[PDB]
Amino acid sequence: IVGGQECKDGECPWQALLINEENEGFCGGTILSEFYILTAAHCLYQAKRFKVRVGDRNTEQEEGGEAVHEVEVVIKHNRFTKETYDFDIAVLRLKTPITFRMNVAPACLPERDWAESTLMTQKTGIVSGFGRTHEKGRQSTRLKMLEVPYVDRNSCKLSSSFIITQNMFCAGYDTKQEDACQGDSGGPHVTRFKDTYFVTGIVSWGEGCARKGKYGIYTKVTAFLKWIDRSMK
Amino acid sequence: RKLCSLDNGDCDQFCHEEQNSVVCSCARGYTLADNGKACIPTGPYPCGKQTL
Ligand SMILES: CN1CCc2nc(C(=O)Nc3ccccc3NC(=O)c3cc4cc(Cl)ccc4[nH]3)sc2C1
Ligand SMILES: [Ca+2]
Ligand SMILES: [Ca+2]
Numbered sequence: 001i002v003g004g005q006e007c008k009d010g011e012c013p014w015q016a017l018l019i020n021e022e023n024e025g026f027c028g029g030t031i032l033s034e035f036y037i038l039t040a041a042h043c044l045y046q047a048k049r050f051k052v053r054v055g056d057r058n059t060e061q062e063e064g065g066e067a068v069h070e071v072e073v074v075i076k077h078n079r080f081t082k083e084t085y086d087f088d089i090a091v092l093r094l095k096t097p098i099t100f101r102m103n104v105a106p107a108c109l110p111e112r113d114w115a116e117s118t119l120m121t122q123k124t125g126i127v128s129g130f131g132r133t134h135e136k137g138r139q140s141t142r143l144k145m146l147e148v149p150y151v152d153r154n155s156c157k158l159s160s161s162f163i164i165t166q167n168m169f170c171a172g173y174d175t176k177q178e179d180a181c182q183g184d185s186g187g188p189h190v191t192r193f194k195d196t197y198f199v200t201g202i203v204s205w206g207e208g209c210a211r212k213g214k215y216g217i218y219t220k221v222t223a224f225l226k227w228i229d230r231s232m233k
Numbered sequence: 234r235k236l237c238s239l240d241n242g243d244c245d246q247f248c249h250e251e252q253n254s255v256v257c258s259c260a261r262g263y264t265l266a267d268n269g270k271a272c273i274p275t276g277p278y279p280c281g282k283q284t285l
Contacts, residue, residue, distance in 0.1 A: 100278035108281035
């Protein structure tokens with residue numbers, strides 16, 4: 001995250017972190033339930049083997065609340081395309097169940113029609129992660145969050161040098177230097193409704209980070225609700 | 234605005250229009266309250282709540 005604020009204690013409890021063999025984070029995920037993590041399909045090609053860390057806010061130090069979970073099943077969308085990052089979504093089933101506690105809790109899945117007319121028509125959603133703090137910099141050792149405006153589909157088509165499919169939506173700022181960035185990929189975009197947070201997006205891609213006249217591109221979760229439901233069995 | 238377009242039909246969470254009336258429902262882990270509008274968490278750590 002470029003700009004934004006730290007997640008304070010208990011503020012971003014649905015955040016998960018994919019960690020490589022070297023125990024370093026390379027992508028985010030969202031906790032959907034005790035066995036299932038939502039992430040981006042493209043994240044699956046960035047580590048041969050990986051695990052899931054939950055409950056972490058500061059990767060510099062184990063503060064006792066952290067837990068690691070191995071992945072039993074990977075379920076990647078069959079139509080994912082490296083070319084365009086269309087269908088950039090995967091679900092992970094964990095070998096052992098997550099224990100919910102301070103800083104570890106799932107985000108809600110909404111119903112599709114209500115989500116589209118009610119959540120995605122709100123001003124802003126919230127994105128979070130341990131990604132880069134600047135386009136060229138290193139990954140944050142602290143969990144950050146950022147409020148990002150939903151962006152008009154048309155404005156976003158015009159801003160983009162790559163195709164924006166109907167499986168994507170745009171969020172972020174025109175010029176203001178705030179955005180997700182590399183390493184945030186896979187993580188939650190959630191929309192608050194009356195003090196309840198629903199998952200609305202997966203951090204997918206952007207042309208650099210926080211560039212002027214550019215936006216962040218997110219997988220549109222509402223397009224995949226049935227697929228997710230099926231995948232969770 | 235009417236029904237669900239009017240302050241979410243007074244529902245806490247999901248609002249649907251069935252016939253010409255509001256029907257509220259809730260995410261998994263919540264139950265609909267007696268008034269048919271509020272969603273009551275059934276356990277600790279319901280989805281979508283920051284942890285206290
Ligand atoms: C169709 N494509 C798929 C992947 C892609 N990656 C691109 C690219 O330009 N990456 C990049 C190269 C160097 C440094 C940073 C980044 N950005 C990123 O990694 C990045 C991911 C991301 C997600 C959100 Cl929601 C908002 C901003 C973002 N920036 S352009 C592009 C187009
Ligand atoms: Ca830690
Ligand atoms: Ca921008």
